[PDB]
Amino acid sequence: MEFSLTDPRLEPHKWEKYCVLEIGDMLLRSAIGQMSRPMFLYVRTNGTS
Amino acid sequence: PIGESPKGVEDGSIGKVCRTLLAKSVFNSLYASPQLEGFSAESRKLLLV
Amino acid sequence: TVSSFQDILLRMSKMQLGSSSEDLNGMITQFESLKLYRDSLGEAVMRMGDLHSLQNRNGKWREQLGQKFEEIRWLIEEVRHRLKTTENSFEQITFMQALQLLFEVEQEIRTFSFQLI
Amino acid sequence: TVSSFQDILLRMSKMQLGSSSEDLNGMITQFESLKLYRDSLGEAVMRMGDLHSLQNRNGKWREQLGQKFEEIRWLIEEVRHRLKTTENSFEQITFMQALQLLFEVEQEIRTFSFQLI
């Protein structure tokens, strides 16, 4: 499970072994204003060696 | 000469060269496969010619 | 975001010195238009902080003005009574000067209060 | 007027030095407070507020919002179609970055406009 800020389905062929979730919102602190961009989660199954 | 661009080629400094070589080594480590070594050997011969 | 503009513009600049499609001259201007509009919009919403702070300060003075009028009135009647109840020329001279000063200052405070609204 | 303040203050001080009265001390304190308030009010009088900056350019600035919205989704659709059609990698990465930039900037503009109104 990994955190990310990039929205899927903008380039979905890259991720075909993932199930993606939306898990909250994050406040982007800048010099002026308030962004409030969404936050995602990437889930995958694997096993190494 | 370290980069490419449409309508021309681009140039850089020593820091760019060192960073590029380090990144090449790291990506070599992360994406190991027999295809890589076969291609490396054969392309080395062609480059020498 | 602002740095993203510089990277996008620098990379689109190199698609025009190697190709045609005047649409790269049609999109490379709307982008600068949005940049100018956004960095103009910035300081405007930045200024709204000072305005509401300025308005708050104008609320306290309106309520001291209230208490000053009552103070002036009460002191007027008290000094008038003290004038009526005294029998020493020094005191009446002082109270003449007082009443004149109070009338002048009350008129000025009323004028300034009218101006503030 | 100020000269009247100090003269009358000295006169009341001399008068009170020879006899103590509740009202006398009360008016002394009230007169001191009134003089201080007059001084502060005059200090605010020769400065005022900044009404010059309160009436800056605001008219058309309220109406270019619709003009910008006119060209927001137009250019977003143009970029979408151009990304779909193209076949290089340079152009593909440039267009993807541009699409991200417009999404962020338009959300920022909408939030700023909503907060300010």
Mutate to test the interface with C, among B5, B9, B10 (most CBs of C within 10 A): B5
Q: In chain D, what residues touch B5 (CB-CB under 8 Å)? A: 90
Identify the CA nearest to C37 among candidates C73, C78, C5, C71: C5
Give the minimum alpha-carbon distance from D94 to chain B in angstroms, rounded to a whole number.
12
The structure tokens listed for C100 are 């004149």
Identify the CA nearest to D98 among candidates D70, D117, D112, D77: D77
The structure tokens listed for D33 are 């407070």
Give the minimum alpha-carbon distance from D70 to chain C in angstroms, rounded to a whole number.
12
**Would you mind telling me the total number of residues written for chain C in this entry?**
117
Identify the CA nearest to D58 among candidates C73, A28, C43, C70: C43
Q: In chain B, what residues touch C17 (CB-CB under 8 Å)? A: 7
Convert A1-49 into a string of H (helix), E (strand) and C (coil): CEEECCCCCCCHHHCCCCEEEEEEEECCECCCCECCEEEEEEECCCCCC
Instruction: Give residues with Cβ within 8 angstroms of A10, minimum separation 6.
Output: D96, D99, D100
Contact B5 C19 (CB under 8 A): no
Q: Hey, is the C-beta of A27 within 8 angstroms of any chain C C-beta?
A: no
Q: Choose among C1, C12, C71: nearest Cβ to D104.
A: C1
Query: What is the spatial order of strands in the sheet that A19-26 belongs to?
Result: A2-4, A37-43, A19-26
**DSSP-derived secondary structure letter, C22:** T
Instruction: Give residues with Cβ within 8 angstroms of C61, minimum separation 6.
Output: C116
Q: What is the DSSP string of chain D?
A: -HHHHHHHHHHHHHHHHT---HHHHHHHHHHHHHHHHHHHHHHHHTT---HHHHT-S-TGGGTHHHHHHHHHHHHHHHHHHHHHH---SHHHHHHHHHHHHHHHHHHHHHHHHHHH-
**DSSP-derived secondary structure letter, C86:** -
The structure tokens listed for A18 are 């993932």
Instruction: Give residues with Cβ within 8 angstroms of C1, minimum separation 6.
Output: D101, D104, D105, D108
Resolution of the model in angstroms:
3.0
Antiparallel, parallel or unpaired: β B9-10 and B3-4: antiparallel
Give the minimum alpha-carbon distance from C78 to chain D in angstroms, rounded to a whole number.
8
Instruction: Tell me the residues of chain D between 52 and 91 that have a Cβ less than 8 Å away from chain B.
Output: 88, 90
**Method used to solve the structure:** cryo-EM
Q: Hey, is the C-beta of A30 within 8 angstroms of any chain D C-beta?
A: no
Residue tagged 């208490």 (tokens):
C67
Q: Hey, is the C-beta of A11 within 8 angstroms of any chain D C-beta?
A: yes
Positive or negative torsion for Cα C86, C88, C94, C100: positive
Helix, strand, coil proportions of chain C in percent (round to 5)?
A: 85, 0, 15
